[PDB]
RNA sequence: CUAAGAAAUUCACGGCGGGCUUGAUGUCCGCGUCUACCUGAUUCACUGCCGUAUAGGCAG
């Protein structure tokens, strides 16, 4: 959607038990819906007082550690779990496997509004960071950086540049600051054109199969593996409707009885972990929401990428 | 008619992190910022059978032939170095605040009544009995679980970390402060007032809890063990995996939180255990027994229904337990 | 307003028994490394005197 007037950088946030289960088909890094919902909660909690609109998040992931283990004699992995409390009779509860992962992400938030003028930049950057320190990012606590060498501060970069050279200069100054990670974007045009190529190969192909084809490592006869352009991960790129839209006080056991509920289902798209200096404009690579609620199709992506 | 909310969910206040354990020597605990981390390594064990025979395999031929085929395990082991007698266990604690506000509540009537009930509690008696006991379980190193049971001296240092630095620092003798008496102390009351001002306010209070335990040279430290189902085929199976964040042994954050919540001296059974952890249907995983059963009217659901729905406020002890569950978090709600 | 909200893996352990890795061997012919320079930028904050002085001044 709308272009960011400024670009706020939350620095390397340490998340201790984030949801490794992104979706029913994918594990690993949490979904970009987690980060877009976090930035909407930041807007909902501090942005309505600074008179700004925090919209769009760029995900960087400097460090990732999944609490997984590879069992003996097995090629695949399983999840290390937590020991829940007992039942009221003293027995062990039924184990529900959740994946936990220790992240270190830095978020680029699109900030636009009239509160950029009314307040200093470091003030609203400090306020969204002191509000983010009491929050959680994929189900995991944001570790608030006590007693290391120095605390990582913020920088709200005003994207309005007086010159294009100064704009490229401070895009470089921000990219150098969020460099040891890998920015996560959405490549759904690549998924569709790979589906088109797979359909010229074999007819009646689904883009679930094209997504899988971009996921695998295919061995080819003369032996060589089929190379890929980038990292090309599967991500859950939103939700698709299963039920019609139910009224607020009509569905049973909702979160609130003032919001319309609709049973949805994941929509697995394609992602691409690329380094942040391959984009040449950091005002791209920000993940927004796209609802279109009359059809279903509640989804997130990063438009204006290419 | 004020029915209960079908969705109730309280967030976790008192949110700790993974307790990083490192190692060095006592009487330079004040320079323990470059102490090397306790690393988790593998060692091989070979054991005989010691479990109970099942009255059909008690015959001497099968037993003697079963000690000739021993189980051979690779276990994870974390030890102090042979020139280090002190274990430094360090974590961070966020005391978030907004302790009675649920993260999810269906009924606006039940939500307003629960906020009215929590505010009636906080004005009548604030977070001063709860946070005193949370400050005790910080001050005595109960989060040192098996790392405390033979230590010559445990010493807990707690630093209120403000915007960039230590705003107020504490230092306790964790072995004088017992694991079963929630007494009074001036510095404990200051830490309790800080945890209270965190649990009351709209923002978080960040503490840095460091506990040094003088165990001995080269002795075993006991980090948290990982719940790994499906260890795999028995040949290369690692029978015990110890938790470590980044080549550095650690205690799980929920284990530290479980030690911090051990404030419940109010359960109706006799206190041969002393304090247990605050849980709905208060259930000790080591004892295998759930105190605060619903056959008595002393679990969290019956007390919260009586307090919020029909205004039968319990005693001050059971309402300490109720508000301690609201600080503890949980996903409540019927169908 | 984040596949949201919640969570103690843990108790114990003897891996050791024993051993000859040996023989044998051509690395080797050949070669243009030149060219041209400011270490000096206050770059030695010195030695001594009068003074009770560390306070302050003075000489070369």
PDB file of C-alpha atoms in Angstrom, chain A residues 56-241:
ATOM      1  CA  UNK A  56       4.946  -2.435   6.764  1.00  0.00           C
ATOM      2  CA  UNK A  57       7.779  -4.486   8.269  1.00  0.00           C
ATOM      3  CA  UNK A  58      11.074  -5.703   6.833  1.00  0.00           C
ATOM      4  CA  UNK A  59      12.390  -8.888   8.412  1.00  0.00           C
ATOM      5  CA  UNK A  60      16.151  -9.429   8.644  1.00  0.00           C
ATOM      6  CA  UNK A  61      17.057 -12.374  10.987  1.00  0.00           C
ATOM      7  CA  UNK A  62      20.683 -11.865  11.973  1.00  0.00           C
ATOM      8  CA  UNK A  63      20.732 -15.056  14.042  1.00  0.00           C
ATOM      9  CA  UNK A  64      18.444 -18.084  14.057  1.00  0.00           C
ATOM     10  CA  UNK A  65      18.562 -21.155  16.289  1.00  0.00           C
ATOM     11  CA  UNK A  66      15.765 -23.704  16.232  1.00  0.00           C
ATOM     12  CA  UNK A  67      15.250 -25.938  19.251  1.00  0.00           C
ATOM     13  CA  UNK A  68      15.336 -29.037  17.079  1.00  0.00           C
ATOM     14  CA  UNK A  69      17.268 -32.268  17.247  1.00  0.00           C
ATOM     15  CA  UNK A  70      18.210 -34.880  14.675  1.00  0.00           C
ATOM     16  CA  UNK A  71      17.356 -38.368  15.985  1.00  0.00           C
ATOM     17  CA  UNK A  72      19.808 -41.237  15.696  1.00  0.00           C
ATOM     18  CA  UNK A  73      19.536 -43.156  12.467  1.00  0.00           C
ATOM     19  CA  UNK A  74      17.114 -40.577  11.067  1.00  0.00           C
ATOM     20  CA  UNK A  75      17.702 -38.001   8.354  1.00  0.00           C
ATOM     21  CA  UNK A  76      14.940 -35.617   9.460  1.00  0.00           C
ATOM     22  CA  UNK A  77      14.508 -33.564  12.624  1.00  0.00           C
ATOM     23  CA  UNK A  78      12.143 -33.455  15.596  1.00  0.00           C
ATOM     24  CA  UNK A  79      11.318 -30.693  18.048  1.00  0.00           C
ATOM     25  CA  UNK A  80      12.617 -30.288  21.591  1.00  0.00           C
ATOM     26  CA  UNK A  81       9.602 -29.735  23.794  1.00  0.00           C
ATOM     27  CA  UNK A  82       8.628 -28.356  27.186  1.00  0.00           C
ATOM     28  CA  UNK A  83       7.217 -30.300  30.116  1.00  0.00           C
ATOM     29  CA  UNK A  84       3.740 -28.966  30.830  1.00  0.00           C
ATOM     30  CA  UNK A  85       2.071 -29.238  34.251  1.00  0.00           C
ATOM     31  CA  UNK A  86       0.165 -32.345  35.199  1.00  0.00           C
ATOM     32  CA  UNK A  87      -3.573 -32.903  35.111  1.00  0.00           C
ATOM     33  CA  UNK A  88      -5.752 -32.642  38.208  1.00  0.00           C
ATOM     34  CA  UNK A  89      -5.355 -36.376  38.777  1.00  0.00           C
ATOM     35  CA  UNK A  90      -1.547 -36.392  38.603  1.00  0.00           C
ATOM     36  CA  UNK A  91      -0.959 -37.838  35.141  1.00  0.00           C
ATOM     37  CA  UNK A  92       1.220 -36.393  32.403  1.00  0.00           C
ATOM     38  CA  UNK A  93      -0.708 -34.253  29.935  1.00  0.00           C
ATOM     39  CA  UNK A  94      -0.967 -35.169  26.269  1.00  0.00           C
ATOM     40  CA  UNK A  95       2.024 -33.671  24.488  1.00  0.00           C
ATOM     41  CA  UNK A  96       1.263 -30.998  21.888  1.00  0.00           C
ATOM     42  CA  UNK A  97       4.370 -30.458  19.786  1.00  0.00           C
ATOM     43  CA  UNK A  98       5.288 -26.789  19.452  1.00  0.00           C
ATOM     44  CA  UNK A  99       8.489 -25.602  17.830  1.00  0.00           C
ATOM     45  CA  UNK A 100      10.542 -22.978  19.616  1.00  0.00           C
ATOM     46  CA  UNK A 101      13.304 -20.956  18.012  1.00  0.00           C
ATOM     47  CA  UNK A 102      15.706 -18.283  19.223  1.00  0.00           C
ATOM     48  CA  UNK A 103      15.764 -15.424  16.744  1.00  0.00           C
ATOM     49  CA  UNK A 104      17.680 -12.196  16.388  1.00  0.00           C
ATOM     50  CA  UNK A 105      15.770 -10.047  13.912  1.00  0.00           C
ATOM     51  CA  UNK A 106      15.837  -6.338  13.174  1.00  0.00           C
ATOM     52  CA  UNK A 107      12.675  -4.753  11.841  1.00  0.00           C
ATOM     53  CA  UNK A 108      12.365  -1.909   9.347  1.00  0.00           C
ATOM     54  CA  UNK A 109       9.027  -0.226   9.982  1.00  0.00           C
ATOM     55  CA  UNK A 110       7.327   2.076   7.527  1.00  0.00           C
ATOM     56  CA  UNK A 111       6.300   5.186   9.429  1.00  0.00           C
ATOM     57  CA  UNK A 112       4.039   7.809   7.871  1.00  0.00           C
ATOM     58  CA  UNK A 113       1.888  10.461   9.490  1.00  0.00           C
ATOM     59  CA  UNK A 114       1.850  13.983  10.846  1.00  0.00           C
ATOM     60  CA  UNK A 115       3.599  12.929  14.050  1.00  0.00           C
ATOM     61  CA  UNK A 116       6.945  12.917  12.266  1.00  0.00           C
ATOM     62  CA  UNK A 117       6.855  16.711  12.420  1.00  0.00           C
ATOM     63  CA  UNK A 118       5.379  17.134  15.902  1.00  0.00           C
ATOM     64  CA  UNK A 119       7.987  14.920  17.588  1.00  0.00           C
ATOM     65  CA  UNK A 120      11.724  14.329  17.209  1.00  0.00           C
ATOM     66  CA  UNK A 121      12.773  11.234  15.302  1.00  0.00           C
ATOM     67  CA  UNK A 122      14.777   9.734  18.166  1.00  0.00           C
ATOM     68  CA  UNK A 123      11.845  10.308  20.529  1.00  0.00           C
ATOM     69  CA  UNK A 124       9.371   8.226  18.543  1.00  0.00           C
ATOM     70  CA  UNK A 125      12.083   5.669  17.783  1.00  0.00           C
ATOM     71  CA  UNK A 126      12.794   5.380  21.521  1.00  0.00           C
ATOM     72  CA  UNK A 127       9.075   5.193  22.299  1.00  0.00           C
ATOM     73  CA  UNK A 128       8.366   2.362  19.872  1.00  0.00           C
ATOM     74  CA  UNK A 129      11.436   0.512  21.160  1.00  0.00           C
ATOM     75  CA  UNK A 130      10.447   0.923  24.817  1.00  0.00           C
ATOM     76  CA  UNK A 131       6.991  -0.319  23.846  1.00  0.00           C
ATOM     77  CA  UNK A 132       8.463  -3.216  21.855  1.00  0.00           C
ATOM     78  CA  UNK A 133      10.543  -4.273  24.858  1.00  0.00           C
ATOM     79  CA  UNK A 134       7.349  -5.312  26.680  1.00  0.00           C
ATOM     80  CA  UNK A 135       5.996  -7.238  23.690  1.00  0.00           C
ATOM     81  CA  UNK A 136       6.453 -10.563  21.910  1.00  0.00           C
ATOM     82  CA  UNK A 137       7.185 -11.254  18.269  1.00  0.00           C
ATOM     83  CA  UNK A 138       6.112 -14.769  17.316  1.00  0.00           C
ATOM     84  CA  UNK A 139       5.042 -16.033  20.681  1.00  0.00           C
ATOM     85  CA  UNK A 140       8.489 -15.422  22.150  1.00  0.00           C
ATOM     86  CA  UNK A 141       9.730 -12.825  24.594  1.00  0.00           C
ATOM     87  CA  UNK A 142      11.794  -9.892  23.361  1.00  0.00           C
ATOM     88  CA  UNK A 143      15.010 -10.029  25.376  1.00  0.00           C
ATOM     89  CA  UNK A 144      15.657  -6.418  26.420  1.00  0.00           C
ATOM     90  CA  UNK A 145      19.515  -6.237  26.381  1.00  0.00           C
ATOM     91  CA  UNK A 146      20.759  -5.718  29.919  1.00  0.00           C
ATOM     92  CA  UNK A 147      24.458  -5.251  30.742  1.00  0.00           C
ATOM     93  CA  UNK A 148      26.223  -6.120  27.497  1.00  0.00           C
ATOM     94  CA  UNK A 149      28.837  -3.862  25.860  1.00  0.00           C
ATOM     95  CA  UNK A 150      26.324  -1.264  24.646  1.00  0.00           C
ATOM     96  CA  UNK A 151      22.584  -1.316  23.901  1.00  0.00           C
ATOM     97  CA  UNK A 152      21.684  -1.247  20.229  1.00  0.00           C
ATOM     98  CA  UNK A 153      19.785   2.024  19.668  1.00  0.00           C
ATOM     99  CA  UNK A 154      17.300   2.896  16.953  1.00  0.00           C
ATOM    100  CA  UNK A 155      17.423   5.082  13.872  1.00  0.00           C
ATOM    101  CA  UNK A 156      14.327   6.513  12.226  1.00  0.00           C
ATOM    102  CA  UNK A 157      15.487   7.234   8.692  1.00  0.00           C
ATOM    103  CA  UNK A 158      13.352   9.821   6.925  1.00  0.00           C
ATOM    104  CA  UNK A 159      12.969   8.409   3.420  1.00  0.00           C
ATOM    105  CA  UNK A 160      12.396  11.897   2.032  1.00  0.00           C
ATOM    106  CA  UNK A 161      15.843  12.814   0.776  1.00  0.00           C
ATOM    107  CA  UNK A 162      16.925  16.232  -0.381  1.00  0.00           C
ATOM    108  CA  UNK A 163      19.017  14.574  -3.084  1.00  0.00           C
ATOM    109  CA  UNK A 164      19.200  11.116  -4.602  1.00  0.00           C
ATOM    110  CA  UNK A 165      22.851  10.797  -3.585  1.00  0.00           C
ATOM    111  CA  UNK A 166      22.010  11.553   0.055  1.00  0.00           C
ATOM    112  CA  UNK A 167      19.120   9.080  -0.147  1.00  0.00           C
ATOM    113  CA  UNK A 168      21.412   6.364  -1.523  1.00  0.00           C
ATOM    114  CA  UNK A 169      23.950   7.373   1.145  1.00  0.00           C
ATOM    115  CA  UNK A 170      21.700   6.778   4.122  1.00  0.00           C
ATOM    116  CA  UNK A 171      20.147   3.673   2.569  1.00  0.00           C
ATOM    117  CA  UNK A 172      23.755   2.452   2.574  1.00  0.00           C
ATOM    118  CA  UNK A 173      24.164   3.685   6.163  1.00  0.00           C
ATOM    119  CA  UNK A 174      21.127   1.642   7.217  1.00  0.00           C
ATOM    120  CA  UNK A 175      22.027  -1.434   5.132  1.00  0.00           C
ATOM    121  CA  UNK A 176      25.462  -1.537   6.761  1.00  0.00           C
ATOM    122  CA  UNK A 177      23.701  -1.513  10.136  1.00  0.00           C
ATOM    123  CA  UNK A 178      21.402  -4.444   9.350  1.00  0.00           C
ATOM    124  CA  UNK A 179      24.002  -6.375   7.329  1.00  0.00           C
ATOM    125  CA  UNK A 180      24.836  -9.745   9.105  1.00  0.00           C
ATOM    126  CA  UNK A 181      21.308 -11.011   8.373  1.00  0.00           C
ATOM    127  CA  UNK A 182      19.215 -11.753   5.312  1.00  0.00           C
ATOM    128  CA  UNK A 183      16.087  -9.851   4.321  1.00  0.00           C
ATOM    129  CA  UNK A 184      12.963 -11.945   3.728  1.00  0.00           C
ATOM    130  CA  UNK A 185      10.856 -10.979   0.722  1.00  0.00           C
ATOM    131  CA  UNK A 186       8.027 -12.507  -1.268  1.00  0.00           C
ATOM    132  CA  UNK A 187       8.543 -13.863  -4.769  1.00  0.00           C
ATOM    133  CA  UNK A 188       5.109 -14.904  -6.001  1.00  0.00           C
ATOM    134  CA  UNK A 189       5.678 -13.762  -9.576  1.00  0.00           C
ATOM    135  CA  UNK A 190       8.584 -16.216  -9.625  1.00  0.00           C
ATOM    136  CA  UNK A 191       6.242 -18.897  -8.271  1.00  0.00           C
ATOM    137  CA  UNK A 192       3.656 -18.191 -10.968  1.00  0.00           C
ATOM    138  CA  UNK A 193       6.183 -18.146 -13.802  1.00  0.00           C
ATOM    139  CA  UNK A 194       7.717 -21.371 -12.488  1.00  0.00           C
ATOM    140  CA  UNK A 195       4.192 -22.809 -12.533  1.00  0.00           C
ATOM    141  CA  UNK A 196       3.860 -21.628 -16.142  1.00  0.00           C
ATOM    142  CA  UNK A 197       7.165 -23.294 -17.043  1.00  0.00           C
ATOM    143  CA  UNK A 198       6.072 -26.502 -15.296  1.00  0.00           C
ATOM    144  CA  UNK A 199       2.775 -26.345 -17.200  1.00  0.00           C
ATOM    145  CA  UNK A 200       4.579 -26.068 -20.535  1.00  0.00           C
ATOM    146  CA  UNK A 201       6.527 -29.095 -19.312  1.00  0.00           C
ATOM    147  CA  UNK A 202       3.522 -31.126 -18.129  1.00  0.00           C
ATOM    148  CA  UNK A 203      -0.136 -30.025 -18.268  1.00  0.00           C
ATOM    149  CA  UNK A 204      -2.487 -29.984 -15.269  1.00  0.00           C
ATOM    150  CA  UNK A 205       0.062 -28.720 -12.755  1.00  0.00           C
ATOM    151  CA  UNK A 206      -0.810 -27.060  -9.486  1.00  0.00           C
ATOM    152  CA  UNK A 207       1.321 -24.310  -7.990  1.00  0.00           C
ATOM    153  CA  UNK A 208       1.563 -26.343  -4.824  1.00  0.00           C
ATOM    154  CA  UNK A 209       3.634 -28.669  -7.017  1.00  0.00           C
ATOM    155  CA  UNK A 210       5.547 -25.694  -8.444  1.00  0.00           C
ATOM    156  CA  UNK A 211       6.213 -24.480  -4.905  1.00  0.00           C
ATOM    157  CA  UNK A 212       7.491 -27.932  -3.976  1.00  0.00           C
ATOM    158  CA  UNK A 213       9.615 -27.921  -7.161  1.00  0.00           C
ATOM    159  CA  UNK A 214      11.193 -24.676  -5.989  1.00  0.00           C
ATOM    160  CA  UNK A 215      11.701 -26.264  -2.560  1.00  0.00           C
ATOM    161  CA  UNK A 216      13.402 -29.553  -3.514  1.00  0.00           C
ATOM    162  CA  UNK A 217      16.884 -30.163  -4.717  1.00  0.00           C
ATOM    163  CA  UNK A 218      16.274 -31.953  -7.994  1.00  0.00           C
ATOM    164  CA  UNK A 219      18.860 -34.412  -9.267  1.00  0.00           C
ATOM    165  CA  UNK A 220      19.157 -34.412 -13.050  1.00  0.00           C
ATOM    166  CA  UNK A 221      20.464 -37.134 -15.376  1.00  0.00           C
ATOM    167  CA  UNK A 222      23.284 -36.419 -17.818  1.00  0.00           C
ATOM    168  CA  UNK A 223      24.571 -36.317 -12.786  1.00  0.00           C
ATOM    169  CA  UNK A 224      24.048 -32.735 -11.651  1.00  0.00           C
ATOM    170  CA  UNK A 225      21.662 -30.960  -9.300  1.00  0.00           C
ATOM    171  CA  UNK A 226      19.341 -28.311 -10.684  1.00  0.00           C
ATOM    172  CA  UNK A 227      20.567 -24.901  -9.576  1.00  0.00           C
ATOM    173  CA  UNK A 228      18.267 -22.294  -8.051  1.00  0.00           C
ATOM    174  CA  UNK A 229      18.357 -18.475  -8.265  1.00  0.00           C
ATOM    175  CA  UNK A 230      18.244 -17.797  -4.531  1.00  0.00           C
ATOM    176  CA  UNK A 231      17.302 -19.334  -1.205  1.00  0.00           C
ATOM    177  CA  UNK A 232      13.610 -19.743  -2.177  1.00  0.00           C
ATOM    178  CA  UNK A 233      11.808 -20.862   0.982  1.00  0.00           C
ATOM    179  CA  UNK A 234       8.122 -21.775   1.313  1.00  0.00           C
ATOM    180  CA  UNK A 235       6.281 -19.244   3.443  1.00  0.00           C
ATOM    181  CA  UNK A 236       2.636 -19.010   4.478  1.00  0.00           C
ATOM    182  CA  UNK A 237       1.539 -15.971   2.500  1.00  0.00           C
ATOM    183  CA  UNK A 238      -1.762 -15.415   4.242  1.00  0.00           C
ATOM    184  CA  UNK A 239      -5.164 -17.024   4.633  1.00  0.00           C
ATOM    185  CA  UNK A 240      -8.017 -18.138   2.375  1.00  0.00           C
ATOM    186  CA  UNK A 241     -11.670 -18.317   3.364  1.00  0.00           C
TER     187      UNK A 241
END
